[PDB]
Amino acid sequence: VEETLMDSTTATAELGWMVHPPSGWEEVSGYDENMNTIRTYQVCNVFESSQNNWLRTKFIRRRGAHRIHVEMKFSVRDCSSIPSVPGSCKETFNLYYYEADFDLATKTFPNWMENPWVKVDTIAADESFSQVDLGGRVMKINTEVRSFGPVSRNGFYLAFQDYGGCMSLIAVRVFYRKCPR
Amino acid sequence: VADRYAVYWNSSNPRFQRGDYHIDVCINDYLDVFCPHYEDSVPEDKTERYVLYMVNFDGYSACDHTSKGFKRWECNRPHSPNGPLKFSEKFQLFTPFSLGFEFRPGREYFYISSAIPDNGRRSCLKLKVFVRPTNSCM
Ligand SMILES: *[C@@H]1O[C@H](CO)[C@@H](O[C@@H]2O[C@H](CO)[C@@H](O[C@@H]3O[C@H](CO)[C@@H](O)[C@H](O)[C@H]3NC(C)=O)[C@H](O)[C@H]2NC(C)=O)[C@H](O)[C@H]1NC(C)=O
Ligand SMILES: [Zn+2]
Numbered sequence A: 001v002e003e004t005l006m007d008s009t010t011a012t013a014e015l016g017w018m019v020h021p022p023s024g025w026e027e028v029s030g031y032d033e034n035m036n037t038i039r040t041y042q043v044c045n046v047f048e049s050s051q052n053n054w055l056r057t058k059f060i061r062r063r064g065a066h067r068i069h070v071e072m073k074f075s076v077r078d079c080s081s082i083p084s085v086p087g088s089c090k091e092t093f094n095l096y097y098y099e100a101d102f103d104l105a106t107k108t109f110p111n112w113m114e115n116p117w118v119k120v121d122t123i124a125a126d127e128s129f130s131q132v133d134l135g136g137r138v139m140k141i142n143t144e145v146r147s148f149g150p151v152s153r154n155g156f157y158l159a160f161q162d163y164g165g166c167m168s169l170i171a172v173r174v175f176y177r178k179c180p181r
Numbered sequence B: 001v002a003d004r005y006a007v008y009w010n011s012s013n014p015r016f017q018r019g020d021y022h023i024d025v026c027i028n029d030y031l032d033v034f035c036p037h038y039e040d041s042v043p044e045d046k047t048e049r050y051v052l053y054m055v056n057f058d059g060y061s062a063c064d065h066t067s068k069g070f071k072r073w074e075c076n077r078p079h080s081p082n083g084p085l086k087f088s089e090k091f092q093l094f095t096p097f098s099l100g101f102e103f104r105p106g107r108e109y110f111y112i113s114s115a116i117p118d119n120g121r122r123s124c125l126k127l128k129v130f131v132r133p134t135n136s137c138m
Helices: B057-062
Strands: A002-007 A026-031 A037-044 A053-056 A068-077 A092-100 A118-124 A142-148 A155-162 A166-177 B004-008 B022-025 B030-034 B050-055 B069-075 B086-090 B107-115 B126-131
Touching: A026 A166, A026 B086, A037 A053, A068 A092, A068 A118, A118 A142, A155 A166, B004 B022, B050 B057, B057 B107, B069 B086, B069 B107
Parallel strands: B004 B030, B022 B126
Antiparallel strands: A002 A166, A026 A037, A037 A166, A053 A155, A068 A142, A068 A166, A092 A118, A092 A155, B030 B086, B050 B069, B050 B107, B107 B126
């Protein structure tokens, strides 16, 4: 029933997603829950004030879906486990989407703000990491799933906004359900 | 250099032949390791392949990762598409991912490699990274 529209883990190359402020999100090599190598994104400008870092995915073809589901796997560092604690450090990030009939996204085109971008939600982690453990990684990657459904255009982009946290977007899986019944 | 330091990890590189290859960097600078790359017209015998390890000084000095290092990268694709296979390391203070790698100003870090087809594990190719103290970095 489930149909994947995009899955960052199957890239087997570079994601090449757009980063509005270059000094914010950046693409880096990472690991999957089942201990596998993939392409991930991270931000950690906890020493800089007024952070508003955006990350935009490639154009995602709709393929006959209206209700879109976004599965996000991520790690968020505990703000108290980072020495110089200003007070602006955060542990959440926002997810947005923008639909369009054509790619057309450039680097400026769709303004980088809540205005044109439609907010899906503020994503929080059930488990932030500080250190702990005494044998090896076993559980510290969060999984959050959200949905939205106006999507009527040929495709859409997804955007993630950070505002002063230290986090890593490990994977993003987008899918819809086209029930045979 | 600037902010990104390119390192061509092969035995023909004079920088490695002098055996004391090191780079002076500042927090948030990057290290880009370029694996040996050969066109398709090579019997893959003269083709160099390596496993790269991050080790401590003693491991660095002896060309031994055993009990003193972490396997870091694998230059196992001497025929990758878009140019040489490349691995990158950012000298960041805090990792946004569990037990990732963190670096500190004024400290030295080391990397060594062992040939895959194995030559002898003798005088390995190695690199020392000196992360400059805050006072030096602007
Ligand atoms: C073994 O190590 C050698 C020493 O590092 C490598 O030689 C370097 O190859 C680079 C190619 O990736 C050259 O860089 C640039 O390459 C582009 C190709 O797109 C050229 O146009 C540029 O002129 C060239 N130089 C720049 C930066 O403008 C390096 O110049 C070259 N270094 C030198 C002078 O030897 C070997 O490639 C590497 N070989 C193996 C076995 O993998
Ligand atoms: Zn030096």
